[PDB]
Amino acid sequence: MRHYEIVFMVHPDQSEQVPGMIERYTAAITGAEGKIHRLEDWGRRQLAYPINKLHKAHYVLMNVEAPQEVIDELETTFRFNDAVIRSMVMRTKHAVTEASPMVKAK
Amino acid sequence: FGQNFLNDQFVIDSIVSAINPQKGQAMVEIGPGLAALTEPVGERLDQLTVIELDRDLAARLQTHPFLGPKLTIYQQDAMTFNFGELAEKMGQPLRVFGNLPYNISTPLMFHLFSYTDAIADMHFMLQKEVVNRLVAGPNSKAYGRLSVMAQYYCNVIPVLEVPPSAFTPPPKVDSAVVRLVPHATMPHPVKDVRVLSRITTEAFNQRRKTIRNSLGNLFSVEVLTGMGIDPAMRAENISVAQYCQMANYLAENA
Amino acid sequence: TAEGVQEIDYKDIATLKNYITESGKIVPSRITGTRAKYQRQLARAIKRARYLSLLPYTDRH
Amino acid sequence: SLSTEATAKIVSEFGRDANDTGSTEVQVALLTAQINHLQGHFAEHKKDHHSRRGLLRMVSQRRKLLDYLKRKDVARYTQLIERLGLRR
Amino acid sequence: RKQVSDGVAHIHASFNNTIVTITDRQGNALGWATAGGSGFRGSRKSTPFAAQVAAERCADAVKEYGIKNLEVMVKGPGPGRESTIRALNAAGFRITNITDVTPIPHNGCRPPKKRRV
RNA sequence: GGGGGUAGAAUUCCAGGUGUAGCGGUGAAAUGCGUAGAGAUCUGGAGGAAUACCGGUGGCGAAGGCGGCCCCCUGGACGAAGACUGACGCUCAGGUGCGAAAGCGUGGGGAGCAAACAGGAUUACCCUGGUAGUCCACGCCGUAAACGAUGUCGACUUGGAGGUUGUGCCCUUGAGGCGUGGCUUCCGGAGCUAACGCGUUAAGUCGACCGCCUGGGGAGUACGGCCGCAAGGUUAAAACUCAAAUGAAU
């Protein structure tokens, strides 16, 4: 029922299996009446400092409207999954749909 | 640096009268200095054994006007040597007194309690904060390690108070005179005195908590119940005699 | 300027690079002459971007 | 705080109509709603004094309103305290 | 016993001493000299003169490998921070870079009792 | 404000590399660490406590107080327009609750610091180790120069420079003009005050209720009651003694 904004980055080596993650998460969100207002992939981006011996990562941004339960479920899967190295979910005042300045500049 | 000698004549009459030095007793007054405390010794003692750590004072101390040849002078630190050596030289326990810097006045009596019989009575003038603790008893805030250890050896009696304005560049503290004279017999003898010091130090290092854990580093509740010591009272409530009880037990057992 | 007439996005590295020093610290508002409200938004955005490794914490290499 | 739908439902129930939102009965009902909700929060967070200080304000204001209603009209007071489970 | 074309000079400019150590890319040390191990002692041990003497001694201790170029890392606020780099480049050394490395915490552990002087 | 996650710098320890003889400390040394390879420099890990820059003379809270980032639960303040109830109010003895640090009880944790303690020096203060404690959960204690040394509520009385946070109207590149609210800092007018000074956030002009004072020392002490595991807290005298003690300014 609230609006969120999930950004997570995944191991560069597994950059090919992201579609399954996106599809699974989309099914989970939409199953409980939640909507999706923006979904973006920035591709591989060079990291600004070495996150536990790596460089570069695959970046995903996704804007969601949904209730608390599905968000807690997504948090738990992120925590238990391994390919994800760093994720962050934020609450937002209202929905947005305009693409990030990041995508346009690229 | 500067020391602060005693000038007022009204105060130093009680001290002389209280010591009442007669003829035939060994007086060992350390640190004569300017002889401010031996000049009022003009009832004299036909002899005295003096100890002075400084050669300059000893040198310009051998003549005075009248002093000359009545006393033997030693130039070694009192804290170092054997007082008891100069005990069979005369044949009687020594009567001593002093006005030493409160700073160095603590270690000497604990260097003098060891030699025991070679010492009969003492009359020192110490700080008021310290004198109260020496004559103190249980269940107060002046009760401490110093009280227990000193009371285990000798008897402590205050003699005279010195109000601060008696000395030149007078300090911010008050001084006092106490009379201590070692016991003829020990009410509670302990095999090893060092173990007694160990127990008292450990107990009074956590003075503010119960002995179930203040002193539980060595004992156990049922043991202390055996000797009739309440395991829920602070260290300041334990009487000297009780403190000698576990002193005996810790050597009797393991 | 820094005070965009809406809010300050934390996904705009090009703008956020204007308000950090060579070492990656935040520039005080005396030097830039920016309003206090938008300065608070700046600090929050910079901290968030630091978490996501889009900016350096300091200068390790 | 109360949701807008719950507030609207209480107002429709206890009020004279859909705009009479300041009657003593509606105010007492709204305060009771909040109090009953907050016991659950405080069962879990017992060491949170800074909000218990606002809960106490709720309780005291409700008591003052009830005393005024007692002195003004008695039958309405009895009916209200029966309708809400107040004072046993 | 090996030729290298790069090097790293590390100086620890404390308030009571100074230490200079020469090492390679990987951080394996080659030669080191201390102000207090150069016949200095006491307050003389903290003077810049001892710092430059130790700098020369260490430079002479590392010419068996044929170092021709290095950059300097400074770590400490004490005196002797700058004389070492000068005495170093006066001994046939080119300074590619000068870096400050002294750590700063983001409120880590609590510091000791400062000098009540 | 309560709960749960997580990040990056730094200190200590452990394990590895390169390497050879000092390090640390002081006014100068010594205890101390090191040839079983220290100190230095690079790589990996473990654990605990605190959040650089932003940072402000800034903000929030009844006061004590509150500082990395993200989520969940939650209290108050403020502003716009409109509708509703109809004096529902102010203050408050006894009573109830919250209340820095130190201290205590039961059980964990322990990196840095450090009462006591153990050593080394110099003529206090210094140096090297280091326990309680500082941290967490749950109980107790109930005090501070807890200070704006300034009780809570309401009304009225000339001005000038700043900060922070809302909002209405015009034309509109608007940091463009005309207004209207809340909180806060510094000068200063009448008036007041012993003076210093306060001055629309009053120590000015008034009203309602509460707390407290009666020369200095003895004394916030003794005896009694209540509270506390203890330390102690709270309520609270007299005999005797002096002719002063005190505030602001010159």
Swiss-Prot record, chain A:
Lineage top rank: taxon: Bacteria
Protein name: Small ribosomal subunit protein bS6
GO cellular component annotations of the record: cytoplasm; cytosol; cytosolic small ribosomal subunit
Positions carrying N6-acetyllysine: K93
Function: Binds together with bS18 to 16S ribosomal RNA.
Quaternary context: Part of the 30S ribosomal subunit. Interacts weakly with uL2 in one of the 3.5 A resolved structures.
Keywords, ordered alphabetically: Acetylation, Ribonucleoprotein, Ribosomal protein, RNA-binding, rRNA-binding
One Gene Ontology term of the molecular function aspect: small ribosomal subunit rRNA binding
Record has Signal as a keyword: no
GO BP term, pick one: cytoplasmic translation
Similarity comment: Belongs to the bacterial ribosomal protein bS6 family.
Post-translational modifications: 5 different forms of the protein, varying only in the number of C-terminal glutamate residues, were isolated. The sequence shown is form bS6-6, which is the longest. The first two Glu are encoded by the rpsF gene, the other Glu are added post-translationally by the RimK enzyme.
Organism: Escherichia coli (strain K12)
Residues of the full protein shown: 1 to 106 of 135
Curated annotation (Swiss-Prot), chain B:
Known catalytic reactions: adenosine(1518)/adenosine(1519) in 16S rRNA + 4 S-adenosyl-L-methionine = N(6)-dimethyladenosine(1518)/N(6)-dimethyladenosine(1519) in 16S rRNA + 4 S-adenosyl-L-homocysteine + 4 H(+)
E.C. code: 2.1.1.182
Residues the record lists as binding S-adenosyl-L-methionine: N4, L6, G31, E52, D77, N99
Alphabetized UniProt keyword annotations: Cytoplasm, Methyltransferase, RNA-binding, rRNA processing, S-adenosyl-L-methionine, Transferase
SUPFAM superfamilies noted in UniProt: S-adenosyl-L-methionine-dependent methyltransferases (SSF53335)
Pfam families: RrnaAD
GO cellular component, one term: cytosol
Top EC category: transferase
Transmembrane residue ranges: none
Protein localization: Cytoplasm
One Gene Ontology MF term: RNA binding
InterPro entries according to UniProt: KsgA/Erm (IPR001737), rRNA_Ade_diMease-like_C (IPR023165), rRNA_Ade_Mease_Trfase_CS (IPR020596), rRNA_Ade_methylase_Trfase_N (IPR020598), rRNA_adenine_dimethylase (IPR011530), SAM-dependent_MTases_sf (IPR029063)
Entry's family note: Belongs to the class I-like SAM-binding methyltransferase superfamily. rRNA adenine N(6)-methyltransferase family. RsmA subfamily.
Role: Specifically dimethylates two adjacent adenosines (A1518 and A1519) in the loop of a conserved hairpin near the 3'-end of 16S rRNA in the 30S particle. May play a critical role in biogenesis of 30S subunits.
Protein name as it appears in the record: Ribosomal RNA small subunit methyltransferase A
Organism from which the protein derives: Escherichia coli (strain K12 / MC4100 / BW2952)
Gene: rsmA
Curated annotation (Swiss-Prot), chain E:
Gene3D superfamilies: Ribosomal protein S11
Gene Ontology molecular functions: rRNA binding; structural constituent of ribosome
Classification via InterPro entries: Ribosomal_uS11, Ribosomal_uS11_bac-type, Ribosomal_uS11_CS, Ribosomal_uS11_sf
Record keywords: Ribonucleoprotein, Ribosomal protein, RNA-binding, rRNA-binding
GO biological process, one term: translation
Quaternary data: Part of the 30S ribosomal subunit. Interacts with proteins S7 and S18. Binds to IF-3.
NCBIfam families, A to Z: PRK05309.1, uS11_bact
Job of this protein: Located on the platform of the 30S subunit, it bridges several disparate RNA helices of the 16S rRNA. Forms part of the Shine-Dalgarno cleft in the 70S ribosome.
Name of the molecule in the record: Small ribosomal subunit protein uS11
